[PDB]
Amino acid sequence: METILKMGLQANVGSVEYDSAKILSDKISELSDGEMKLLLYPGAQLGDDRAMLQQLSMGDLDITFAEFGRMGLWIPRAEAVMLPYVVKNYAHIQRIFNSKFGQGVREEMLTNFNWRALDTWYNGTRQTSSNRPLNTISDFEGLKLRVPNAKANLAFAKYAGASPTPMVFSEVYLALQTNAVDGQENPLPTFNTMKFYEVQPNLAMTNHIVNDQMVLISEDRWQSLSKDQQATITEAVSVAGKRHTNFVNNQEKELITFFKAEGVNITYPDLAPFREAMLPIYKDFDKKIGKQLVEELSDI
Ligand SMILES: CC(=O)N[C@H]1[C@H]([C@H](O)[C@H](O)CO)O[C@](O)(C(=O)O)C[C@@H]1O
């Protein structure tokens, strides 16, 4: 081996994201005949996504994952893509990523922050688990709902009427287990592999945020690779992404049966009241960004 790359991710070994990172790594080695290798640093051992993104900018890490909307911390308009109920499905996030708006964000990521977006995959639609059944939006009143350190998720919790509790991902299981919080929200593969179902007796299909999953490489690293090495990474990303998105789609169907068998009570609230409750988020965001951006993205 001669060219050694490093990838970091928050998700643990055993997660869909890790499984796909291992595919990346295996395909990079296979297609390069062992000349290239990808080392893997899971479980947020390097920090959270925000920290790993900075490490990519500095060249201390080569590859990491990030949602398009997470770019909003550095490129404010991108946040709109993570506001609850804006993105309808994966095909919609693909239209956004490929649109002139998406291209403009991707160019800014490369120019300012040394991030080259190679693809974006489907990471699932977030759902809300809890220690009591949630059948209507009114049931969110008083719910101590853990959220990531992300304003969109915090706003979902706030406008649903819950009491948002930001917390890093690695601390969630213990907080649920001890009832320090009453619930969390994440896609179903995550709810499975993090074992949150072991400590959450209810799951509500709020369908509130569609998460993509960009594969970012340091632009400096990319430019230093040969054309052959670039082709290897492009093909590895294509192979891994096809498998990732398909696995998430399959799991979103198959996991319902599994969670029921494990004793989880699954509820399906009417979502029209949830969508209505989120409208002030869009008005505020449009006011801050200076245009009707949420509506323009929703119509892309
Ligand atoms: C790429 C990445 O690290 N994604 C992580 C996301 C994002 O940080 C968040 O959605 C904001 O974009 O948060 C989690 O879902 C969470 O803490 O519940 C864990 C997940 O691994």
Numbering used by the authors: 0 to 299
Pull text from the paper.
Tripartite ATP-independent periplasmic (TRAP) transporters are a major class of secondary transporters found in bacteria and archaea—but, not in eukaryotes. First reported over 25 years ago6, they use energetically favourable cation gradients to drive the import of specific carboxylate- and sulfonate-containing nutrients against their concentration-gradient, including C4-dicarboxylates, α-keto acids, aromatic substrates and amino acids. A functional TRAP system is made up of a soluble substrate-binding ‘P-subunit’, and a membrane-bound complex comprising a small ‘Q-subunit’ and a large ‘M-subunit’. The best characterised TRAP transporters are those for sialic acid, otherwise known as the SiaPQM system.
We determined the crystal structure of SiaP bound to Neu5Ac in a closed state at 1.04 Å resolution, as a crystal structure of substrate-loaded SiaP enables us to model the SiaPQM complex. We confirmed that SiaP binds sialic acid with nanomolar affinity and that the crystal structure is representative of the protein structure in solution. The docked structure shows two calliper-like helices of SiaP, α2 at the N-terminal lobe and α5 at the C-terminal lobe of SiaP, interact with the scaffold portion of the M-subunit. Residues R49 and N148 (SiaP) form a latch between the lobes of SiaP at the surface of the substrate binding cleft, enclosing a number of ordered solvent molecules that extend toward the substrate. One hotspot involves the invariant D181 of SiaP immediately prior to β8 and K232 on the loop between TM7 and TM8 (L7-8) of the M-subunit (right). Adjacent to this interaction, the surface-accessible, conserved K143 on the β6 strand of SiaP interacts with D36 on the loop between TM1 and TM2 of the Q-subunit (right). This strand in SiaP extends from the protein surface to the Neu5Ac binding site, with K143 located two residues upstream of the conserved R145 which directly coordinates Neu5Ac. Thus, SiaP binding to SiaQM may pull on this strand to release the substrate. Analysis of these hotspots using mutagenesis showed that K143E caused a significant reduction in transport activity (but not the ability of SiaP to bind sialic acid), though the putative interactors D36A (SiaQ) and K232A (SiaM) did not reduce transport compared to the wildtype.
